[PDB]
Amino acid sequence: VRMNVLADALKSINNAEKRGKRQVLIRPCSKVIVRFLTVMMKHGYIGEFEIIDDHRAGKIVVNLTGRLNKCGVISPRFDVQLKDLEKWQNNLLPSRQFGFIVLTTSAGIMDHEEARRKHTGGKILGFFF
Amino acid sequence: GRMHAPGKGLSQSALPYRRSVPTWLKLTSDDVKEQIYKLAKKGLTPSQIGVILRDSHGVAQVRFVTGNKILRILKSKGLAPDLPEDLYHLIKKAVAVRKHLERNRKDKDAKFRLILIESRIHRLARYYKTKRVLPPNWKYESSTASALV
Amino acid sequence: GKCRGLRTARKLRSHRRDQKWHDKQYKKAHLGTALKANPFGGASHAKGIVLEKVGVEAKQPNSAIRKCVRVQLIKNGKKITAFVPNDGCLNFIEENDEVLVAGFGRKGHAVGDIPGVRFKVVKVANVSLLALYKGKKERPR
Amino acid sequence: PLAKDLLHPSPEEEKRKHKKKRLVQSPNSYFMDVKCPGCYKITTVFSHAQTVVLCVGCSTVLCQPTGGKARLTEGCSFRRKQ
RNA sequence: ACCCACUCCCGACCCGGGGAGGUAGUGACGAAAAAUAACAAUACAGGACUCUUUCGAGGCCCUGUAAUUGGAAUGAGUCCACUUUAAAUCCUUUAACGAGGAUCCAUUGGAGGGCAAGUCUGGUGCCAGCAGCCGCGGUAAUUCCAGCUCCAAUAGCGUAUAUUAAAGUUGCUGCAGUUAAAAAGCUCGUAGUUGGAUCUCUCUCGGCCGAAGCGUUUACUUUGAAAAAAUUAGAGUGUUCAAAGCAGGCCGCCUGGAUACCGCAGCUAGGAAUAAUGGAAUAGGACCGCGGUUCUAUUUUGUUGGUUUUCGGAACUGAGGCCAUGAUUAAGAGGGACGGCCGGGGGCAUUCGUAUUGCGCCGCUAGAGGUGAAAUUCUUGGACCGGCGCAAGACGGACCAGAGCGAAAGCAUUUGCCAAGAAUGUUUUCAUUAAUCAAGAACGAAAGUCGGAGGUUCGAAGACGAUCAGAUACCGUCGUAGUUCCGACCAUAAACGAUGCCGACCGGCGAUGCGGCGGCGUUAUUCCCAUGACCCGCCGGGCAGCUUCCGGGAAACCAAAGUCUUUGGGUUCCGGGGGGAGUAUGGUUGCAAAGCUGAAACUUAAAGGAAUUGACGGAAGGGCACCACC
Ligand SMILES: [Mg+2]
Ligand SMILES: [Mg+2]
Ligand SMILES: [Mg+2]
Ligand SMILES: [Mg+2]
Ligand SMILES: [Mg+2]
Ligand SMILES: [Mg+2]
Ligand SMILES: [Mg+2]
Ligand SMILES: [Mg+2]
Ligand SMILES: [Mg+2]
Ligand SMILES: [Mg+2]
Ligand SMILES: [Mg+2]
Ligand SMILES: [Mg+2]
Ligand SMILES: [Mg+2]
Ligand SMILES: [Mg+2]
Ligand SMILES: [Mg+2]
Ligand SMILES: [Mg+2]
Ligand SMILES: [Mg+2]
Ligand SMILES: [Mg+2]
Ligand SMILES: [Mg+2]
Ligand SMILES: [Mg+2]
Ligand SMILES: [Mg+2]
Ligand SMILES: [Mg+2]
Ligand SMILES: [Mg+2]
Ligand SMILES: [Mg+2]
Ligand SMILES: [Mg+2]
Ligand SMILES: [Mg+2]
Ligand SMILES: [Mg+2]
Ligand SMILES: [Mg+2]
Ligand SMILES: [Mg+2]
Ligand SMILES: [Mg+2]
Ligand SMILES: [Mg+2]
Ligand SMILES: [Mg+2]
Ligand SMILES: [Mg+2]
Ligand SMILES: [Mg+2]
Ligand SMILES: [Mg+2]
Ligand SMILES: [Mg+2]
Ligand SMILES: [Mg+2]
Ligand SMILES: [Mg+2]
Ligand SMILES: [Mg+2]
Ligand SMILES: [Mg+2]
Ligand SMILES: [Mg+2]
Ligand SMILES: [Mg+2]
Ligand SMILES: [Mg+2]
Ligand SMILES: [Mg+2]
Ligand SMILES: [Mg+2]
Ligand SMILES: [Mg+2]
Ligand SMILES: [Mg+2]
Numbered sequence A: 001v002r003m004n005v006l007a008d009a010l011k012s013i014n015n016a017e018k019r020g021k022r023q024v025l026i027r028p029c030s031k032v033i034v035r036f037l038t039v040m041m042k043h044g045y046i047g048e049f050e051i052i053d054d055h056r057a058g059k060i061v062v063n064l065t066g067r068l069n070k071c072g073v074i075s076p077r078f079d080v081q082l083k084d085l086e087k088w089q090n091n092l093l094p095s096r097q098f099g100f101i102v103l104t105t106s107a108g109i110m111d112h113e114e115a116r117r118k119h120t121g122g123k124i125l126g127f128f129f
Numbered sequence B: 001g002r003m004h005a006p007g008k009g010l011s012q013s014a015l016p017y018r019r020s021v022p023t024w025l026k027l028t029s030d031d032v033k034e035q036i037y038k039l040a041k042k043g044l045t046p047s048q049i050g051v052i053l054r055d056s057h058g059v060a061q062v063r064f065v066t067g068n069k070i071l072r073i074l075k076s077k078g079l080a081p082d083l084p085e086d087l088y089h090l091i092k093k094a095v096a097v098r099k100h101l102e103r104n105r106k107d108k109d110a111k112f113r114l115i116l117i118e119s120r121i122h123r124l125a126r127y128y129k130t131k132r133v134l135p136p137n138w139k140y141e142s143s144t145a146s147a148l149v
Numbered sequence C: 001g002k003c004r005g006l007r008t009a010r011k012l013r014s015h016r017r018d019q020k021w022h023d024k025q026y027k028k029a030h031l032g033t034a035l036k037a038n039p040f041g042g043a044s045h046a047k048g049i050v051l052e053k054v055g056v057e058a059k060q061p062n063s064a065i066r067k068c069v070r071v072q073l074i075k076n077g078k079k080i081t082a083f084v085p086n087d088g089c090l091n092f093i094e095e096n097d098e099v100l101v102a103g104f105g106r107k108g109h110a111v112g113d114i115p116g117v118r119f120k121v122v123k124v125a126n127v128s129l130l131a132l133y134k135g136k137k138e139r140p141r
Numbered sequence D: 001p002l003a004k005d006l007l008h009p010s011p012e013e014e015k016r017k018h019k020k021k022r023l024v025q026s027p028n029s030y031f032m033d034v035k036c037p038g039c040y041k042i043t044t045v046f047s048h049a050q051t052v053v054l055c056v057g058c059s060t061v062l063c064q065p066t067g068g069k070a071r072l073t074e075g076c077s078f079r080r081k082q
Numbered sequence E: 001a002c003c004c005a006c007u008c009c010c011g012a013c014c015c016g017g018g019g020a021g022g023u024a025g026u027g028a029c030g031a032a033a034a035a036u037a038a039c040a041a042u043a044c045a046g047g048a049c050u051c052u053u054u055c056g057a058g059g060c061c062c063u064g065u066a067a068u069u070g071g072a073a074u075g076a077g078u079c080c081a082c083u084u085u086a087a088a089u090c091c092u093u094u095a096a097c098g099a100g101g102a103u104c105c106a107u108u109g110g111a112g113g114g115c116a117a118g119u120c121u122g123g124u125g126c127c128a129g130c131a132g133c134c135g136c137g138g139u140a141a142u143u144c145c146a147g148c149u150c151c152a153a154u155a156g157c158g159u160a161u162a163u164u165a166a167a168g169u170u171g172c173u174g175c176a177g178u179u180a181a182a183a184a185g186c187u188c189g190u191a192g193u194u195g196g197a198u199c200u201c202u203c204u205c206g207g208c209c210g211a212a213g214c215g216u217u218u219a220c221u222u223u224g225a226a227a228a229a230a231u232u233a234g235a236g237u238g239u240u241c242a243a244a245g246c247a248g249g250c251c252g253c254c255u256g257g258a259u260a261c262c263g264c265a266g267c268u269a270g271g272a273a274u275a276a277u278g279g280a281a282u283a284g285g286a287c288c289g290c291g292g293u294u295c296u297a298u299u300u301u302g303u304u305g306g307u308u309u310u311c312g313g314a315a316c317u318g319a320g321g322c323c324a325u326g327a328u329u330a331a332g333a334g335g336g337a338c339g340g341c342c343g344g345g346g347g348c349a350u351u352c353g354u355a356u357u358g359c360g361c362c363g364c365u366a367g368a369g370g371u372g373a374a375a376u377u378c379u380u381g382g383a384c385c386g387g388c389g390c391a392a393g394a395c396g397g398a399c400c401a402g403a404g405c406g407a408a409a410g411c412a413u414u415u416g417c418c419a420a421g422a423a424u425g426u427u428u429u430c431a432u433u434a435a436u437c438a439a440g441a442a443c444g445a446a447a448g449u450c451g452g453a454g455g456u457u458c459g460a461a462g463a464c465g466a467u468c469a470g471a472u473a474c475c476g477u478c479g480u481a482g483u484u485c486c487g488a489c490c491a492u493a494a495a496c497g498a499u500g501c502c503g504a505c506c507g508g509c510g511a512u513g514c515g516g517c518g519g520c521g522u523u524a525u526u527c528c529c530a531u532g533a534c535c536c537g538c539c540g541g542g543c544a545g546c547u548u549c550c551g552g553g554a555a556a557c558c559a560a561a562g563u564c565u566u567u568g569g570g571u572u573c574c575g576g577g578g579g580g581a582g583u584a585u586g587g588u589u590g591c592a593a594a595g596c597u598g599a600a601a602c603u604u605a606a607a608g609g610a611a612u613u614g615a616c617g618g619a620a621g622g623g624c625a626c627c628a629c630c
Helices: A005-019 A031-042 A085-092 A112-118 B029-042 B046-055 B062-066 B070-077 B085-103 B109-130 B142-148 C009-020 C024-031 C033-037 C129-133 D011-016
Strands: A023-026 A049-052 A059-063 A071-073 A100-105 A108-111 A122-128 C045-057 C065-073 C079-083 C098-103 C119-124 D031-035 D043-046 D077-080
Touching (some): A005 A071, A005 A122, A031 A049, A031 A059, A031 A108, B029 B046, B029 B062, B029 B070, B046 B062, B062 B070, C024 C033, C065 C098
Parallel strands (some): C079 C119
Antiparallel strands (some): A049 A059, A100 A108, C045 C098, C098 C119, D031 D043
16 A cells, blocks of 8 residues: 655655656645755755645646756654754765755754754654755 | 555545535535434434535535534534444445354355455554554454354 | 565574575584594594505506505594605505695685595604605615 | 646536545535425435435435436435535 | 882781782784974076067976085984982983985885786796786787886785675665565464544642642653763863873962763653553443431540540431533444345256267178388278267367456356345445454365275377387377275465555556446337347446556556655565575475475575667568579
8 A cells, every 4th residue: 555655745845857747736735744845845856846635635737847957855754963964864865966865853854964054853754956 | 555465546636725615505514414313313423414514505614613523512412323333334345254254164265355354454453453442352352243243 | 586574583593594404514513423523533634654655547547556645543543544745755665654644725625636645644653754755864774 | 738827726626536545535426405306304425325315304215326426316305515 | 020119908906917019021913203404506308477470588486317526413222420219221402423326325025907006127938927806818918927117004014714884685773575685375264563533630738839639551752860980072271282180370479170971761840742451331420419227436524433425537328409410423334134137156966968989780891090111000800981879987069258257276058946245226234343364263276195886088107000210209009006975084276467465645548347326319119117139338346458758667667566866655475696405414294205493514706687789599570692493
């Protein structure tokens, strides 16, 4: 059965971007998905998206700009401390000039640079570059 | 897909977006409640009550009109089945297959289907035990299966 | 595929050790039959008494006679065929004399032409074979 | 393909799609107002009715169950509600 | 071997003792530093640099045969004396002696490739030998035995063995399972693992704070505390440098002997995203006041005393008011209903069809059978053939399809009964009930094993006849077990899609089976709506097909075998060079045959997969020739 809706959303947007499409629809949606899409927003990788309210679970129509190389999930959602963040970004990111690791800390959902700024660790969700 | 069959079908009801009662529906919540009560006295499960109300009396969702689901309505006033209707129907099916089997001993498809039905019955019974609908000592027995139904 | 859940550590570890048992080198090193069957008993070298000089046929593509010796290890009495490396070196060995034997180079596996031979003579009568071959020392009397 | 607006689906292809596969799922059924040949007064009927709907004010059978949409009795007229 | 001189310990002790310990001896375990020459002049292979016109000139700079010269500098040694030390030795310091083959003489491994450096010379001649591997050697050996030369490291360098990296060849990161080794025959199912949306601190005490709870509990994250030294990282510090050490610096002073790190578990205080968990649905509810029931601590009160109440505290409680009184959604999750269907799905009974074999009768009959050719074989005690009937068992042709059904094995004459089932339809119902599965279960082709019944055909074995050099076979004749049914075992197949199951995304096209939704127009009918048969579309679940630069792959090929170094959706089984070997042994199941589990010794440099060229073929097609034919 379907588990970890975030993985399905990220796979759908990744496959749509590999195919060159300008919009992708993701279903089901979630608050975790929306926060991940917003952190992807603030760095210019995705573009504007819109939530459709079906009374069961919303859908998301995501506009796509060709700037997205990869976006994926890391399951299981392992706990990451400040010390191990360097190892995680060395493993996942393609460079130190660009790319982001997304994590849930008690401060919210954000990229690894903001987590370094706020001096908080958490649980890894995924990555995009 | 199906729990006990290879098939993976997509066939179900699609409730509409609007949760408001239609204007043409002149029935009140109390009228729907009394209709439900007398239908239960006639000896129908909540499923049949919903089908009859939808087909003849023009109500789409009883929960939509009365703000409450059918089984909760029946249990609230008192006349509700001792064990849940889906479990009852599963037990009835198992009893029927067993009755067919005891005379047709050579049937091997019936034995397999019976085992599948018993597995479904056990899963449902354990779920209902965890939700305290059934007493913890409640167990499925082939000898008393016909007695239960 | 492999299990990936957060609580799967025991499954992963048990599977890894069970499958580790299917590795040739790991099973050889950890089962204990190889060490028991090893004539050297896990030692790098051994000492033996020369039983007889023997000539072993080289394997088919090349024709030669490899000069070896049958030795009886002192520490366990096992009998072994050991290769005497250089030429004329068989003339440095006599019957019923002390010889220090080492491995041949591949962990108890036969080397090159010589079939079923995994030991080579290093010392004869407490003087090195290389010293005798190069004239640095002579055979004690 | 490529640049196809998923936000603003066209009504024709939205009806073309499966009921559960639309932007928002909308059932294909409806409620009908059925008038008997002789009885002056109407009855509310489900389009995909699974029961033999009897006239509440008579003995006439209004519709017969089928695989999909229920079959109205010959002569019994009907109008779509809403 | 020497000594309690240092570090410390013991005793009654400032005093004695200590093979603890220290100091030497042996010591290529290992680590640090570091000689085996430097320079000048010649002479030049000489070279660059330089003008000139080639020589030449260019005498600026570099290198080297330099058994050419030349003086300078030294420590390895020998050895006084100090210094060192408990006494010494060593090191350091200093006299004297101490270098031209500066003979005061560097070795260990190599020179085909891997891998740096000779297809130079002599010897051997598949011998001797080398060779970790591929290989070299059979009279011209780049590989052996040597000479010369060369190169790698160098006071060190080979060899054997354990182990680490190489090994993404154990794969958590991060491997594989169609054909290379590999997915259980199929389904159910306990444990395990994983699991869809959803919800933005105050009332009392003490001096506005300090206190008190408890907000359901955590996991997680950050902080704080507690955590031996040595080692590791690291700050300072010229041991002559360095490995070290914890010392040292200034003209009595000055200054170190830091800091970090220390999983896990246990303490501590912030955060509240994520992830579990609970809070009212027999109201076994919250809050306000009420009233009650009971027991009880003290107020009473200069005091005594007297005293039961009051107050306070509880538990047990009954009527009230109030809560906007309390149930999120109904998943392109899953059960269960309901409706019309649908299908070689299964069981029981029943029915039909020829054919085969045999029997009875009738006709004419000399052959009939078998084969490449025959023989074995049945035949005037009528064989074969033709006709009419009877019987016994087996089997359901053509229709029959890259069609349907079933979990898989598997499933096809008619009809009836029985219980099943997927998909479709659905504004029904429950409300997470789910996915995959150690243990444990059901089924499981054929063959085979025990009992019965039946035994037509076919037919292992067997007996013959042929063929062949031989035939214990291929061909033929007969023919036992079996093949058939019932009841018990067996649980194995190339049980195959040689491709686990669940879920999402990613191209087209035409068909096809089932269900539903539409639409002209033809047919059953003759007119009525129907409902069937076609025709044109749509949706959903299936068996598939074609196509495609989706993308993958060693490729064949795959729309999954794609969405993989841009490596993580969940989860089961399982592989790790080829043999030995699915063998031995132990266990377990079985009447048995056998099933399941399942090694090691030893052996070996390949075995293997896809694909390309040839060669070959007793495979298929063409074409040619009087050294073919007609
Ligand atoms: Mg299942
Ligand atoms: Mg002392
Ligand atoms: Mg003393
Ligand atoms: Mg000692
Ligand atoms: Mg000495
Ligand atoms: Mg050594
Ligand atoms: Mg050293
Ligand atoms: Mg000296
Ligand atoms: Mg040399
Ligand atoms: Mg040589
Ligand atoms: Mg080499
Ligand atoms: Mg080279
Ligand atoms: Mg070697
Ligand atoms: Mg060589
Ligand atoms: Mg290793
Ligand atoms: Mg590595
Ligand atoms: Mg591999
Ligand atoms: Mg294979
Ligand atoms: Mg399979
Ligand atoms: Mg389970
Ligand atoms: Mg969740
Ligand atoms: Mg420490
Ligand atoms: Mg240090
Ligand atoms: Mg801790
Ligand atoms: Mg639903
Ligand atoms: Mg004759
Ligand atoms: Mg006849
Ligand atoms: Mg037929
Ligand atoms: Mg099992
Ligand atoms: Mg069975
Ligand atoms: Mg069978
Ligand atoms: Mg049989
Ligand atoms: Mg029998
Ligand atoms: Mg026969
Ligand atoms: Mg014979
Ligand atoms: Mg035969
Ligand atoms: Mg098998
Ligand atoms: Mg298989
Ligand atoms: Mg159809
Ligand atoms: Mg139509
Ligand atoms: Mg279709
Ligand atoms: Mg991978
Ligand atoms: Mg499996
Ligand atoms: Mg192997
Ligand atoms: Mg046994
Ligand atoms: Mg097994
Ligand atoms: Mg091939």
